[PDB]
Amino acid sequence: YQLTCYFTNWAQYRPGLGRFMPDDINPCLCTHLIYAFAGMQNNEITTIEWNDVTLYQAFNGLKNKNSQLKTLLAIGGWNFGTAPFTAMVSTPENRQTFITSVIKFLRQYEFDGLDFDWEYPGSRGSPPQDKHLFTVLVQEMREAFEQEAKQINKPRLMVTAAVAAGISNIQSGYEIPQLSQYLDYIHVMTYDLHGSWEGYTGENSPLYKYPTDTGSNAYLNVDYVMNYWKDNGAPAEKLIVGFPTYGHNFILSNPSNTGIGAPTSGAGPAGPYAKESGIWAYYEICTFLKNGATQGWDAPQEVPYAYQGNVWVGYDNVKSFDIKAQWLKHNKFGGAMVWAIDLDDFTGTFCNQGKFPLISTLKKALGLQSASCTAPA
């Protein structure tokens, strides 16, 4: 199994114990590390943060401590939008310009591949033609990667994609069988499946449906989404299940109504470290629990929740990660990806479950505890 972990280049800006740099990553923890995010200018890949080059050096330098470790650069993200992607795929000339720039960039900064984080082809502003044009882009990149590997006689650069979990988004965004042929890995964003935008409490990443999930809401779980991808043309072994080391929080309309589907009045409070509206890092959730919150277990969906006063949080813990990992193995998927390494209790000081308790749980469950971790020759 692969264990693929996303690192975010804005985690450096978090105060005190929240600050997370490339050198805070345990090089032995994950099989793949992905750097979020890269941007685009004039159809060419670029940095985003002022110190990205320095961070690339430290990030990819982790491979000097684990000879097996592979790294990828993620282009796009939610704030990036679809506009530069649409413009870049719109003409073959723009695509060639992009692919050329990507090869140069990845080789220069010592990445082993590119992860497409276009959110999403065919939606969020992206026109209908982008569904097919994304397939074309991916194939062209893959084939360009294959050609380059032979000309310079080095291992081939990988091409992967983070892909939608919402059924409508999937249907308008991806030619699944064709896309699956050229992608090395398919990173399925099986989270953010519920949130305050809905007006009621719901789980970030429930494994199965809740009994009250009727109609289209019955698609809002990890099991349905992964099987949707598989059944519609993606090989199980290329499919990578998304695991969140963060939760979504809510303001309860009635503090005495604390179950799944309870009315909410909006997003819950930003955390003191991530400072994200309606989102808490796992280590931020541990503080919540330590400060007197009541623990809940959403049994049908195999995930925890917690509440105190008018604040309610749906998340993942050691127990839920373990359950999902067993499910993953039974279903013979390619492995797990994690958003994000910097949101797990990396110091171990918040949850008292050891360093990186959530990702370590995956490492153990997926048979990677004895994985080789030695500096290269």
Ligand SMILES: Cc1[nH]c2ccccc2c1CN1CCN(c2ccccn2)CC1
């Ligand atoms: C929007 C947002 N901001 C945050 C700040 C801290 C923690 C979580 C979040 C999220 C929610 N998703 C996280 C996962 N993600 C992606 C994006 C690309 C690839 C994988 N996964 C989509 C947004």
